[PDB]
Amino acid sequence: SDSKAIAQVGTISANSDETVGKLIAEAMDKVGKEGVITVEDGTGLQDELDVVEGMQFDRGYLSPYFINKPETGAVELESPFILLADKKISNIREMLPVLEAVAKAGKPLLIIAEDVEGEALATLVVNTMRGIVKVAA
């Protein structure tokens, strides 16, 4: 159970390589009992470990203009609202009351849906930079 025994086992199973055992021990200490550790090819000459806390999925923004910080080229929202819609969002008329209520609230909004077509994306992005609502899709 202790980290020393885990490091020793990882070293022995890796053809007596101390660094691999130490890295695996640190990774399993950080990620917890229920976590998952994966191995992929790197780019440099030294191994590295990246730990992700929270939830993360491989889906990005649907429009580059949603970016509010060009310094890092990323969209960041503080205390947002999350709308979960499992229906094909095509016409803006379906989203009027929610956007009006959130604009009355005054805090950013995030839409997680499978897809959004061109018209609704254009309406949202137009609303973004004008200072009405801060929305990411």
Binding site: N91, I92, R93, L96, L99, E100, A103, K104, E119, A122, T123, V126, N127, R130, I132, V133
Partner: protein, 95 residues
């Protein structure tokens, strides 16, 4: 000046609103063309079977709601788009 004939009415289509029920800007096909216009010129009246003419109920200066159709025509006068269309397409008068 331009005057219609019989029961045709000259109207000026109002600008389409960009904000609907709040500050949200509507752009694209969601913002439908306005169905409200300002009447400009009114003809003498529709001709009856007997031969007499009756004046129109709509008066110049009012705001009317009309339905777009095949009988509605768009003409360019005084470098400004106007609509020449029959009185039968007027649905209601605002105020």
């Amino acid at each position: 000046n331009i005057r219609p004939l019989h029961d045709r009415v000259i109207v000026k289509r109002k600008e389409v609103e960009t904000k609907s029920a709040g500050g949200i800007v509507l752009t694209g096909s969601a913002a439908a063309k306005s169905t409200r216009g300002e009447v400009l010129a009114v003809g003498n009246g529709r001709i009856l079977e007997n031969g007499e003419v009756k004046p129109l109920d709509v008066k110049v200066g009012d705001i009317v709601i009309f339905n777009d159709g095949y009988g509605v025509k768009s003409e360019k006068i005084d470098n400004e788009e106007v609509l020449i269309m029959s009185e039968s397409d007027i649905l209601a008068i605002v105020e």
